[PDB]
Amino acid sequence: AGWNAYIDNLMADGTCQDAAIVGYKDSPSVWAAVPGKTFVNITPAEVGVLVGKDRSSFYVNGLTLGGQKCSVIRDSLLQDGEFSMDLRTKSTGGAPTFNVTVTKTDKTLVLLMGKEGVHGGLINKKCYEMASHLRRSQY
C-alpha cells in the first residue's frame, strides 16, 4: 500500500518494462502505472474493449493500450480460473515487439509488458500470480 508499491513489486525482477493497476468499474481509471511508459495512458474506451461483451472484433481489428497497438493471442479474461488475456504489440519499421498480459480481478485489471525477448509465458504467470493475490484479498 498504496498502489505504487504494487508497480514496484511488479517491476522488481527486471523482466518487465511496464505495469499498471487499473480499476474497471464505474468510471475507469489507472490506479498506478510506471510513469513515462504506455499503460499510464490507457483510456476508459480501451478498458471497455478489454472487459466488454464483444470478444471477437478485436481479432481482426486489434485493440490498443495507451495508444499502443497490440494483437490478441489468447482471450480468457472473463473465464473463471484463468482471468487472462495475452497480447503482442505491433510495430513499424522492424522495431521490437513485446508480450502483454492483462489479468482481471473483482475490481482491477493488472497489465504487464515484457522487455525485449521476454517470453509471454513469464509475463502471463507473473501477471496471473498478482491477480490471484488480489482476488484473494477481495479486490
Binding site: A1, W3, A5, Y6, S29, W31, H133, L134, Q138, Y139
Partner: peptide
C-alpha cells in the same frame, strides 16, 4: 474520483 486503498502485498520468499 479516487481509488481504494491497496491491500497488503503477498509475503515473500
Amino acid at each position: 474520483g479516487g481509488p481504494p486503498p491497496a491491500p497488503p502485498l503477498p509475503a515473500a520468499q
